[PDB]
Amino acid sequence: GSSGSSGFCGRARVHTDFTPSPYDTDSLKLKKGDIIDIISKPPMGTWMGLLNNKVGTFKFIYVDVLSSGPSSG
């Protein structure tokens, strides 16, 4: 179970379904409608997120960064 506090940069949804090779374990399995908890995000390069007890590398073009925004109702 979750301890209580969440430690993740942000959250991104998968809009595209991608499947890595049967030899590449680094690449995560992206499926339409899957949340990925981002751990770290460098200034230039790929991002790192955890999915199904597995953290790898994924592109942003495959996901859609969800930014709540400054103002809200």
Swiss-Prot record:
The chain holds residues 555 to 614 of 1247 of the full protein. Expressed ubiquitously, with highest levels in lung, placenta, spleen and thymus. Down-regulated in the majority (74%) of breast tumors in comparison with corresponding normal breast epithelial tissues. Expressed in the epidermis, epidermal keratinocytes, dermal fibroblasts and melanocytes. It is found in: Cytoplasm. It is linked to Dyschromatosis universalis hereditaria 1: A form of dyschromatosis universalis, an autosomal dominant pigmentary genodermatosis characterized by a mixture of hyperpigmented and hypopigmented macules distributed randomly over the body, that appear in infancy or early childhood. The trunk and extremities are the dominant sites of abnormal pigmentation. Facial lesions can be seen in 50% of affected individuals, but involvement of palms and soles is unusual. Abnormalities of hair and nails have also been reported. Cancer, alopecia, pigment dyscrasia, onychodystrophy, and keratoderma: An autosomal recessive genodermatosis characterized by hypo- and hyperpigmented macular skin lesions, progressive alopecia, palmoplantar keratoderma, dystrophic nails, teeth abnormalities and a predisposition to squamous cell carcinoma. Residues 8-67 form the SH3 domain. Interacts with GNAS. Interacts with IQGAP1. Interacts with TRAF6 (via C-terminus); the interaction is LPS-dependent. Interacts with MAP3K7, CHUK and IKBKB. This is SAM and SH3 domain-containing protein 1. The gene is SASH1. Is a positive regulator of NF-kappa-B signaling downstream of TLR4 activation. It acts as a scaffold molecule to assemble a molecular complex that includes TRAF6, MAP3K7, CHUK and IKBKB, thereby facilitating NF-kappa-B signaling activation. Regulates TRAF6 and MAP3K7 ubiquitination. Involved in the regulation of cell mobility. Regulates lipolysaccharide (LPS)-induced endothelial cell migration. Is involved in the regulation of skin pigmentation through the control of melanocyte migration in the epidermis. The modification Phosphoserine is found at S67.
